[PDB]
Structure formats: structure tokens, C-alpha cells
Amino acid sequence: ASRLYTLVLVLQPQRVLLGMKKRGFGAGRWNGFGGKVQEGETIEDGARRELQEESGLTVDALHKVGQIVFEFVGEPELMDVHVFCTDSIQGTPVESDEMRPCWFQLDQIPFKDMWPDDSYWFPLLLQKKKFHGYFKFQGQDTILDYTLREVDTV
Ligand SMILES: O=c1[nH]c(=O)c2ccccc2[nH]1
């Protein structure tokens, strides 16, 4: 049993937009934009909504790039995270209550202040490969086990 979440990475050939999370789950970490999917909206529409909410931005098209399932020891609900990607954005990243957006060079991606799974699956993101992931967490810092597989169909 699982719960739907979104994750949106604005990926430009020289840079990638991340946002610093100021409160709530996983605060004090750089991350993609997104959150819970609501009843009555599609997964992609939820991904867009959260992008607009957290960074101000709107996009033409969002591309499905992966799916990562997260399991936390002691929590029965799984996180079913649908990952999206886009180069073309409309507007300017501005700050919100949830996220402080900031651009990063592709050779300065701040992995040590990101969720530790990001080390594993970013290579496939940057190479424009579609993927299915699973990561079992113990607390916020410790990956007990994982799988990561390139797929053709997300
Ligand atoms: O890149 C990530 N973003 C997340 O929101 C996240 C949430 C829970 C576990 C890993 C995560 N990894």
C-alpha cells in the first residue's frame, strides 16, 4: 500500500533548478519540487500545481522520467514518487513558504545536502534515461537497501 507524490526537476544542459525545503518533511535539504497528489487531479497536474506553488514557475510540457518507491522503517505507508523533467520553463524562480529555489551548475550539485538516494539516480536523469527505483530508508540518513533499473516505459 502506497501514497502518490510528485517530483519535478528543471533540467537545463548546463544547470538544474533545486529548492531548499524550509519546513515539514525533509527540511534543510535541496530537492526537486512537488508534494502530495490530490483527489480529483492527474499526477502530472499535481506536479505542475506544486511547481507553481513552490517556485512560481509554469512549464509547457512535463516529461515522465521515473518512478521511485520509498519505504521508511516504522512507517507502513510507502511513498510512490513520480519523477518529472523539463528544460523549457516560463517565468522566473521566486521564493515561497515551502521552497527557496536556486540554480546549480551540473558539476556542483549539492549531494551532501540532498536526500542520499539522489547520488544513485541522478546519473540516469542527466543522461535522459527513464528509470524505476526502490529505496528502503531507516530514518532520514540511512539507506538499508535499494534497487534501480533503467526502463523503457515509466
Ligand atoms: O530526492 C528525493 N526527494 C524526496 O522528496 C524524497 C523523499 C523521501 C525519500 C527520498 C527522497 N528523495
From Swiss-Prot:
PTM comment, free text: The N-terminus is blocked.
UniProt keyword terms in alphabetical order: Cytoplasm, Hydrolase, Magnesium, Metal-binding, Mitochondrion, Nucleus, RNA-binding, Transit peptide
Regulation: Inhibited by 2-oxo-dADP and 8-oxo-dGDP.
Record note on what altering residue 54 to A does: Loss of ability to prevent DNA damage. Expected to cause loss of enzyme activity
Top-level class of the enzyme under EC nomenclature: hydrolase
Record note on what altering residue 55 to R does: Loss of activity
Tissues where this protein is expressed: Widely expressed with highest expression in thymus, testis, embryo and proliferating blood lymphocytes.
Function, as annotated: Oxidized purine nucleoside triphosphate hydrolase which is a prominent sanitizer of the oxidized nucleotide pool. Catalyzes the hydrolysis of 2-oxo-dATP (2-hydroxy-dATP) into 2-oxo-dAMP. Also has a significant hydrolase activity toward 2-oxo-ATP, 8-oxo-dGTP and 8-oxo-dATP. Through the hydrolysis of oxidized purine nucleoside triphosphates, prevents their incorporation into DNA and the subsequent transversions A:T to C:G and G:C to T:A. Also catalyzes the hydrolysis of methylated purine nucleoside triphosphate preventing their integration into DNA.
Subunit organization: Monomer.
Protein name: Oxidized purine nucleoside triphosphate hydrolase
Organism: Homo sapiens
